[PDB]
Amino acid sequence: QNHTFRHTLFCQDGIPNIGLSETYDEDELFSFDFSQNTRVPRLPDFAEWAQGQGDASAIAFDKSFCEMLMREVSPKLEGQIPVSRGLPVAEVFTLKPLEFGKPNTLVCFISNLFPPTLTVNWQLHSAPVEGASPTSISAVDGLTFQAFSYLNFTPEPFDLYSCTVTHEIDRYTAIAYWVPQ
Amino acid sequence: GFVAHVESTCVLNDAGTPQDFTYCVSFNKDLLACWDPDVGKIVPCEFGVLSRLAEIISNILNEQESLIHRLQNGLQDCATHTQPFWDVLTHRTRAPSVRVAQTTPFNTREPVMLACYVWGFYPADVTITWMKNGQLVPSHSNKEKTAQPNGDWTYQTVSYLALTPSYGDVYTCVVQHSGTSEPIRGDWTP
Ligand SMILES: *[C@@H]1O[C@H](CO)[C@@H](O)[C@H](O)[C@H]1NC(C)=O
Ligand SMILES: *[C@@H]1O[C@H](CO)[C@@H](O)[C@H](O)[C@H]1NC(C)=O
């Protein structure tokens, strides 16, 4: 039946001061690297298509118009009207159902993310840990965002993983805990 | 601390036929202006406190030969733009995996709560039904969710069912995924 392809470009001040997110039925196809000036597949399956398209001339214009509003409009009303803030929500769960001793992957799902500026840190009984994948923010219907952070791990009975989201640098944190079932 | 979006949604049906198209500028979470292929120009929306800003945004965008001509053509791009992979997307599927187990009782007093774990599928569309000895069991505390995305381009969800263990009883979770004609099943006996 119907399917929705979304090409959201946004700009703000902070963390990623500019981004592009192209989805299809809410799942992200590929984002866009403004440095190397190229699209980045969310999955290798995609690659080939993020390669072509050459719609660069639009992105260029969109980008400019965006940055432009940030430049002029913002300062004008900074402190004049209220900032749409969205208190982020974090949830944690496993990719596959729980099987002790057998390899798995924890997922930290962030929702109601606004603005798209954050930092995710994983711990295990407060003991910080790395090996986590980059947190990917993606645009979502309704002018909002969501982000995911994955961490492979081998589940054990006395585990206690926590996913810490730190919104807007230092204003408002969110901590989601996960224990064995 | 503000944020702006230059959003352009492209809606298409299977095969690859464009159905709708929009372009819309939005400052803060408020929405400013959207193109209108009828009027052929970029028309303002949300006449809020920012009604003023709205007019401007559009005018500026309007006085741009490229943009207007970019938009105008729109739907025709939508096809080309998506075409090379549209078949892949509309027809890419990962079959679900099911596993039934018992978990600590949620709501209700029954001594056993069964949990059907359906995971690793795409698209999100899926239906779970339970069966007691080959017999369909209507919903009462059969509370699931709405297929949680993994971002991994896969989805998962879970279905619960409370019961009373009587040997000889066999419970089966039936799952029909829009990506597989073969209904999957997983049984559970006391
Ligand atoms: C998608 O929504 C309906 C239901 O499939 C479809 O008829 C329509 O063509 C699409 N939406 C628009 C706005 O065209
Ligand atoms: C998790 O395991 C898979 C398969 O071994 C691997 O591709 C991935 O890089 C691992 N870790 C992360 C953080 O993705």
Side-chain angles (χ1 to χ4, degrees):
Chain A
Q1 221 52 288
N2 276 318
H3 298 281
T4 303
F5 178 87
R6 185 178 285 113
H7 174 86
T8 307
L9 179 146
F10 58 98
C11 51
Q12 55 163 336
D13 43 287
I15 309 302
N17 54 330
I18 189 164
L20 185 280
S21 180
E22 279 169 312
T23 59
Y24 155 78
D25 295 341
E26 306 309 275
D27 282 282
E28 182 173 69
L29 242 339
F30 31 57
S31 56
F32 190 84
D33 192 335
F34 289 108
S35 327
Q36 287 75 258
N37 211 250
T38 186
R39 279 175 164 87
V40 184
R42 172 50 223 244
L43 285 178
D45 306 25
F46 311 140
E48 297 184 60
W49 313 314
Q51 173 70 122
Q53 281 167 92
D55 56 339
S57 36
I59 282 66
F61 175 73
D62 294 332
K63 178 181 178 296
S64 323
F65 187 67
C66 209
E67 292 173 329
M68 188 254 109
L69 304 171
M70 284 307 304
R71 196 194 315 126
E72 323 291 348
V73 202
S74 312
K76 164 64 207 64
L77 44 161
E78 268 289 338
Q80 200 212 292
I81 64 162
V83 287
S84 312
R85 193 199 195 189
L87 283 206
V89 176
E91 281 187 61
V92 195
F93 53 83
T94 67
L95 265 202
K96 316 175 203 63
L98 189 48
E99 281 262 77
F100 286 125
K102 295 181 183 171
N104 219 319
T105 310
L106 286 167
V107 181
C108 190
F109 179 65
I110 299 74
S111 48
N112 196 60
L113 187 60
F114 202 97
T117 262
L118 74 171
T119 24
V120 181
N121 315 264
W122 291 91
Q123 306 71 228
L124 174 61
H125 287 289
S126 312
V129 36
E130 75 298 76
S133 67
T135 77
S136 38
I137 307 179
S138 20
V140 108
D141 191 8
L143 318 196
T144 342
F145 302 85
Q146 61 179 25
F148 297 64
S149 187
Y150 313 83
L151 172 79
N152 297 12
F153 81 122
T154 59
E156 291 294 349
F158 321 106
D159 288 356
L160 171 60
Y161 292 84
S162 29
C163 169
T164 295
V165 182
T166 334
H167 203 220
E168 286 174 285
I169 319 165
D170 49 27
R171 40 183 280 100
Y172 191 74
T173 76
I175 318 85
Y177 303 110
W178 179 95
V179 287
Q181 52 76 200
Chain B
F2 288 123
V3 183
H5 312 61
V6 176
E7 200 168 74
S8 53
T9 294
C10 177
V11 178
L12 310 73
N13 72 348
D14 286 79
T17 318
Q19 238 86 128
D20 187 23
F21 192 99
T22 35
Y23 182 103
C24 303
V25 167
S26 358
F27 188 94
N28 213 12
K29 281 224 64 167
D30 190 1
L31 185 142
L32 307 188
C34 287
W35 192 47
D36 189 344
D38 244 21
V39 189
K41 310 181 301 179
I42 287 186
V43 185
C45 312
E46 291 334 290
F47 325 84
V49 36
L50 312 181
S51 295
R52 199 177 180 139
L53 177 49
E55 293 179 290
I56 312 178
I57 303 295
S58 65
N59 308 149
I60 288 60
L61 301 166
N62 285 315
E63 55 188 58
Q64 307 293 328
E65 64 301 297
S66 311
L67 178 63
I68 302 281
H69 202 290
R70 172 184 143 188
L71 305 183
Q72 296 280 112
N73 204 187
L75 290 175
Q76 282 226 156
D77 154 69
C78 264
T80 337
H81 193 122
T82 64
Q83 213 298 305
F85 54 70
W86 194 261
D87 214 283
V88 174
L89 293 189
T90 55
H91 308 132
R92 171 196 138 113
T93 53
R94 291 292 145 107
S97 194
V98 184
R99 184 252 202 65
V100 185
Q102 171 183 191
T103 308
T104 332
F106 269 53
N107 192 345
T108 310
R109 64 203 313 116
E110 311 290 315
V112 172
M113 178 67 110
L114 280 188
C116 186
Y117 297 140
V118 185
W119 78 96
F121 58 95
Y122 185 64
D125 185 42
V126 76
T127 56
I128 304 172
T129 32
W130 288 85
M131 280 192 195
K132 172 176 170 63
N133 286 234
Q135 287 309 75
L136 280 176
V137 181
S139 184
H140 203 150
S141 287
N142 300 11
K143 312 305 293 170
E144 294 79 59
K145 204 176 184 186
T146 314
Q148 169 74 62
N150 285 325
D152 193 78
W153 263 63
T154 48
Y155 285 86
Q156 64 174 278
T157 184
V158 40
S159 188
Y160 300 116
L161 170 59
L163 59 99
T164 358
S166 316
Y167 294 6
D169 265 330
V170 57
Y171 297 106
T172 311
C173 176
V174 181
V175 52
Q176 297 171 179
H177 176 49
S178 45
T180 304
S181 43
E182 293 318 288
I184 328 295
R185 57 179 61 243
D187 326 81
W188 188 88
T189 42

